[PDB]
């Protein structure tokens, strides 16, 4: 009988110059946070972020706020976010997020340099 709203998604910024040493062009951070700030660690045990197989160490796990992972790369792909709860009786929740790196044609003319892709969801208990 407990519902906890969350927001999840990513920010990304273009390097300016295509890094030749590896071909990466963007830095990005993927995250999960409560919709209204609160101690999410009180009920979340860990959040696992599973990255594309082109990453060494594709499994990243965060156990305290901020629940975020930062990387660089060149491509958009679907990140699998798995939220584990302190209660072992609570099955984990899985979210899918399409990493956004490339900016809309609206948002050059507006005057933003950071890409944001963010979504609302709700975690339900019993």
């Amino acid at each position: 009988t407990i519902v906890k709203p969350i927001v999840y998604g990513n920010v990304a910024r273009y390097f300016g110059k295509k890094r030749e040493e590896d071909g990466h062009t963007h830095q990005w951070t993927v995250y999960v946070k409560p919709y209204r700030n609160e101690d999410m660690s009180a009920y979340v045990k860990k959040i696992q972020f599973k990255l594309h197989e082109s990453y060494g160490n594709p499994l990243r796990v965060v156990t305290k706020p901020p629940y975020e992972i930062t990387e660089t790369g060149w491509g958009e792909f679907e990140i699998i976010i798995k939220i584990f709860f302190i209660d072992p009786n609570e099955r984990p929740v899985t979210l899918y997020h399409l990493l956004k790196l490339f900016q809309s044609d609206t948002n050059a003319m507006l005057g933003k340099k950071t890409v944001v892709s963010e979504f609302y969801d709700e975690m339900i208990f019993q």
Partner: peptide
């Protein structure tokens, strides 16, 4: 799985 991975683009551009």
């Amino acid at each position: 799985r991975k683009a551009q």
